[PDB]
Amino acid sequence: LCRSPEGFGPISFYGDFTQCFIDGVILNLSAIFMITFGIRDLVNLCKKKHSGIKYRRNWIIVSRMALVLLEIAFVSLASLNISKEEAENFTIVSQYASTMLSLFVALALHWIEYDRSVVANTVLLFYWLFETFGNFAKLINILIRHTYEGIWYSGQTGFILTLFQVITCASILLLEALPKKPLMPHQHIHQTLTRRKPNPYDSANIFSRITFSWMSGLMKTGYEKYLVEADLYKLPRNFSSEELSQKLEKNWENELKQKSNPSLSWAICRTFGSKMLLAAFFKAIHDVLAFTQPQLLRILIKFVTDYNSERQDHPQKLPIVRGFLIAFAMFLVGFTQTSVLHQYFLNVFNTGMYIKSALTALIYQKSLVLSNEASGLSSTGDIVNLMSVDVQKLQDLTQWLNLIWSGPFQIIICLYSLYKLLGNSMWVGVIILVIMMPLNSFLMRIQKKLQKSQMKYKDERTRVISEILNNIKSLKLYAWEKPYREKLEEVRNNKELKNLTKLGCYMAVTSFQFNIVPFLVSCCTFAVFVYTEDRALTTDLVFPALTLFNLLSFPLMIIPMVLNSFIEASVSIGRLFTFFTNEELQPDSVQRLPKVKNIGDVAINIGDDATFLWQRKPEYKVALKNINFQAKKGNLTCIVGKVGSGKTALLSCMLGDLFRVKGFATVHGSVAYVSQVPWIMNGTVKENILFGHRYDAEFYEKTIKACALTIDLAILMDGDKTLVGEKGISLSGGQKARLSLARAVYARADTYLLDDPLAAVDEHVARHLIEHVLGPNGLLHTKTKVLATNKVSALSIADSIALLDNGEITQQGTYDEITKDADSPLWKLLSNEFGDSSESSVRHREQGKVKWNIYLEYAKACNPKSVCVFILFIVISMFLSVMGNVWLKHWSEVNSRYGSNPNAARYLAIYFALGIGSALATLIQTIVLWVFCTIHASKYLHNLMTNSVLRAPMTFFETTPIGRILNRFSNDIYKVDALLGRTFSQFFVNAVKVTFTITVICATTWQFIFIIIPLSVFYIYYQQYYLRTSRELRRLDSITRSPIYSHFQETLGGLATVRGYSQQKRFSHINQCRIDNNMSAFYPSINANRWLAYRLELIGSIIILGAATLSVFRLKQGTLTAGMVGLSLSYALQITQTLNWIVRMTVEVETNIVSVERIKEYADLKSEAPLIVEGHRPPKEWPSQGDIKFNNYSTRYRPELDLVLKHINIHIKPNEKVGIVGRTGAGKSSLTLALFRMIEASEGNIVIDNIAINEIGLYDLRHKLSIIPQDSQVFEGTVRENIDPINQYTDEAIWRALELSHLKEHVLSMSNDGLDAQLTEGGGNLSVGQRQLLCLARAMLVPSKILVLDEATAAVDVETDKVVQETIRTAFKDRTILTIAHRLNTIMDSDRIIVLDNGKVAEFDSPGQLLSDNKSLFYSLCMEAGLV
DSSP states (O other), X not given: OOOSSSOSOSSOSSSSOOHHHIIIIIHHHHHXXXXXXXXXXXXXXXXXXXXXXXXXXXXHHHHHHHHHHHHHHHHHHHHHHHHHSSOOOHHHHHHHHHHHHHHHHHHHHHHHHHHHOSSOOSHHHHHHHHHHHHHHHHHHHHHXXXXXXXXXXXXXXXXXXXXXXXXXXHHHHHHHHSOOOSOOSSOOOSOSSOXXXXXXXXXXXXXXXXXTGGGTTHHHHHHSSOOOGGGSOBOOTTOOHHHHHHHHHHHHHHHHHTSSSOOHHHHHHHHHOHHHHHHHHHHHHHHHHHTTHHHHHHHHHHHHHHHHXXXXXXOSOOOTHHHHHHHTHHHHHHHHHHHHHHHHHHHHHHHHHHHHTTSHHHHHHHHHHSOHHHHHHSOSHHHHXXXXXXXXXXXXXXXXXXXXTSHHHHTHHHHHHHHHHHGGGGHHHHHHHHHTHHHHHHHHHHHHHHHHHHHHHHHHHHHHHHHHHHSHHHHHHTTOSHHHHHHHHHHIIIIIGGGTHHHHHHHHHHHHHHHHHHHHHHHHHHHHHHHSSXXXXXHHHHXXXXXXXXXXXXXXXXXXXXXXHHHHHHHHHHHHHHHTTSOOOOTTSOEEEOSOSOSSOOEEEEEEEEEEESOSSSSTTTTEEEEEEEEETTSEEEEEOSTTSSHHHHXXXXXXXXXXXXSOBEEESOEXXXXXXXXXOSEEHHHHXXXXXXXXXXXXXXXXHHTTOHHHHHHSSSGGGOEEOTTSTTOOHHHHHHHHHXXXXXXXXXXXXXXXXXXXXXHHHHHHHIIIIISTTSTTTTSEEEEEOOOSHHHHHOSSEEEEETTEEEEEEOHHHHHTTTOTTTTTTOOOOOOOOOOOOOOOOOOOOOOOHHHHHHHHTTOHHHHHHHHHHHHHHHHHHHHHHHHHHHHHHHHHHSSSOSOHHHHHHHHHHHHHHHHHHHHHHHHIIIIIIIHHHHHHHHHHHHHHHTTSOHHHHHHSOHHHHTHXXXXXXXXXXXXXXXXXXXXXTHHHHHHHHHHHHHHHOGXXXXXXXXXXXXHHHHXXXXXXXXXXXXXXXXXXXXXXXXXXXXHHHSOTTTTTTTOHHHHHHHHHHHHHHHHXXXXXXXXXXXXXXXXXXXXXXXXXXXXXXXXXHHHHTTOOOHXXXXXXXXXXXXXXXXXXXXXXXHHHHHHHHHHHHHHHHHTTOOOOSOSOOSOOXXXXXXXXXXXXXXXXXXXXXXXXSOEEEEEEOOXXXXXXXXXXXXXXXXXXXXXXXXXXXXXXXXXXXXXXXXOOSTTSOHHHHGXXXXXXXXXXXOOSEEHHHHSOSSOOSOHHHHHHHHHHTTOSHHHHHHOOSTTOOEEOSSSSOOOTTHHHHHHHHHHHHSOOSEEEEBOOSSOOOHHHXXXXXXXXXXXXXXXXEEEBOSSHHHHTTSSSEEXXXXXXXXXXXXXXXXXXXXSOHHHHHHHHHTOO
């Protein structure tokens, strides 16, 4: 529209913008950009802000002002220079005018910003960079025109001035974008405590908020140490859960009010929607910028094949420069694509986190407010699952909410992008891509079914091994290791792995299908383009088509996922909306009033003709009817009735729970409350006493003495610091009641509503306590007390007792008055300071280099000669696909050289037989991974692990808890089973694809080897940082995400008390703090992903520039064809995504190969003695009779503990029915364990009939020694096994044993199955005592010369005891026995009783002598017990 050699050309004949477009739009929009936004910011920063916190005029502003004055002088001087020659030009002179007019405002911002702002302004960065971009484009223009036409577009002075306007504007932009530091001024500090610094997202110039460079200070720390939970950064400005919850609550309340038919979905959209349109806009920009990368590739190939065709042999010879400016546009497009995609991810994940912390914290307030009946409809599981999972859906719908349209938008501008390029014959490709979706659904469904079956089989295996880990003592005692370990091998090696090779086969099939369809689209649409009525198929119609098909593949495999998530979230929103409309406590129930009433002990609260109800559903009338009663201040008033007839109902009414129909209901002062079933929160008992109150020590001792729990305080091993575990695992009913009452009294409330706490406390303690706290002489004498009881003494102590019935008041009067009224229910029955409160946020071991030896152990366990084949076929499956593309390149070049397609069939066939090779190689490599590599390791790790756990010294089982030693058989085997096998594939198939991409690019342009080295260094840098910090920032996400629900269900358990103490605020703030403590660790967790992805995608787009400018140099050297720049650059476009998987899967390896370390930790545990040596007498015990002969015997439980036995030398006689007894804490209980070598013999030995047992081995010894463990153990299974693993005895033998054990009938009792009746622990089992008879049957079935009888320390049925004694004295008549009976009665009738004390054999054989020898120690305990 203005005079110039070329008009308003966006792109000149060369590759640049024309001089009438550079300063006509690019350098004119920036100026109006300021005159619209920067002036607004100038107003805003100088309209309400006025301070001097920002430090003095440092040299940074001293330089920015100078480099703006020079810049404005240069703009004016360039206008002056152009005013002389080439003067009359509207666009240029107008651009100069608007330019200095806007640069003055830029100077103004530079002045105001440095005081009234700490964040570098956004406008004065984006404008002030657009200035540099426009001036740089103009300089490039006046260089291109000079080099290609001799003339200068400006006159060799405008050149110098524009070069300066570039060289200063860029320098001053870098000066503005890299400020020194904030708050340098003499101010000392804002937060003196400085517990957690404010996160750097605030105080981060827009460049840092775009390049995510504000985390590069956390990462470094996270790389050089583990990240303790107090090493993170607090939430940004507007992430506090209070703000979000209150915003959403206000909006949703307006929703319930105005919109007649409300909906929570609109309440969420109307609130957190303005941050979603921005994400949608960024997604649209990224989608547009993603489908102009192929267009630029197509343009570059067309340019190359035109330039070469021209140089073979003058109307405007093609300029080489255009090549570079299509090799640079491909970099700008990629860079802006990453910088806009990651802004979309940030602005969508933030809206995700604005619902996981504004609905998580808004469910809790409802739960405190909702009425009782709706609480009881679904008690605890569903309500906590309503935000453990039913909100994680709403926090994941956001990630796939823009793909409702951005899926049907990457498709339209891809189908159209292909139709303009590849003609009408693209449809036969998209039809394949569609009709493969049902196959993907089919395969994923079958894979899910196989995963379910495999998980069920794993549960079966883990229960079978849980039984062993539970009764390992019995297992080692009976020598049942092998014949009941092969019972686990028969599950793993036969039923479980057979459901893993099939899973491997189907994973191989789906991997093959995921590697052929990407190639079966391009080949099958070329096969139609060539043959149908068409034209040449040249290089610029194939290599763009490959990229377009690849970009089309993704938006089609996310259509099922998005709709699945959408339907799931619709269900979840239905659940939430039916939650948020229940009846909520109807707060007009009780009119609470302060306790300023009086000092003369007036009636606190009144019920006049009151008719309360649980809720307006049935029982809504007779819940509580016609109430008229007082409660007196400072007088213990009590109500008594039968169960639920008005006892708990009235108290629950006085708390405001129940609703009233008519009549006044008041309550004076703060109220304490003890629920009928007292509840204990999860924390230290001191916290329970305090219960969120200011700590007054002296009163704490006064209470702990008062409630008679100081004795229990001594009982607890930790005392006031004792952690009261989940639902009071460390407490029982009586201490629970006393603890609840202690909490109540320490609350020091002005009205005590005691709902029958006495029912679980000791009666002596009860009458001890009635006067300490309740009675007139108690500390709570001067406070009013309503009480529910059934005990009698309190009624006499009470003052104004009320007798009720069926939720109705019978009478109200004093004990003497009513007793004088001949009332059968009663007459015939026989000023302080309440505590304060305070609240706030609740809330080294340096890293080490990766463990490489574990990978080598996994390889050696993974058949190393067969893991080379896996990598070999990975290499082959990639090399064949690369050669398929090379053949595509050659065939396309042959098509382009000719007019038409010369030999369609031959080229097309040899191309097809080069993709099928790749897919087939992928199939075979995945099969070798599963069938040969993984399953041959999962069958060698677990085999070795279980073979070395079942042979660990019993001390090992004693020390470590069962909870973890079983975890390694549950998860650390499953993760090795079917979670680490594929994790090496996706990392090895992507550590080769990148290698071959680099190799094919370096083969086209060898100089590229100098770009990939400095890029690989930064790559490993960023990868190591992201690994070592994302592992932490994910662990810290997992740790702090459980206590949110572990606290919600805790609140749901005791809800009438938290509401009862009227401190609903404190628990709500506890929830808000527990939510912010999760967001504070989840924010860095995902912004770490953004940081890494930005770094890699930037690295992924320096290669595109590097492989397209080092390519055009080759072209200018005249050795480049169109194919050589189509192939290499079509791979270069793909390296971005495969540069993330190779990192993501490197994270997934690290969090999985820790499992193999845990396995190998156990697989080499120090074992016990060798099983079998030459000590092999035939009857499994050397003679048919056995007399154990000790000598010098002494040993210890553990190497550090004291000696259990001290130099014992005792000669037991054959078939001598001795009985070993001793008072507790003697070491007698571990004389069996030292007979079966379960604890090794330190000194001496145990010669059993002329042969010892030290040099014999366990398995041969432990055959013929029968024990009856103190805790009788039965395995999950059938009687046929629980009595014999060998089945070497006739079923008649088992039946005669059960008859002589008097338990043949009780097998058929529960189940008529015969012998294979079901047994387990939990469910199908015998009685709590019959297991003793069962173990007796086990002992008697083996014909045993020695039975080391042990008795349960707990109670037992004496009839079972005499049954056992009779059968062992009738079947073991001539047979040795060592009865270790704690109760002296069981062994006082034995043959030669012998007493042990502190590992010393004390007395001699004859028992009567021990009764009649200086009142011996045995006789001393005999008198003490009461048997003599």
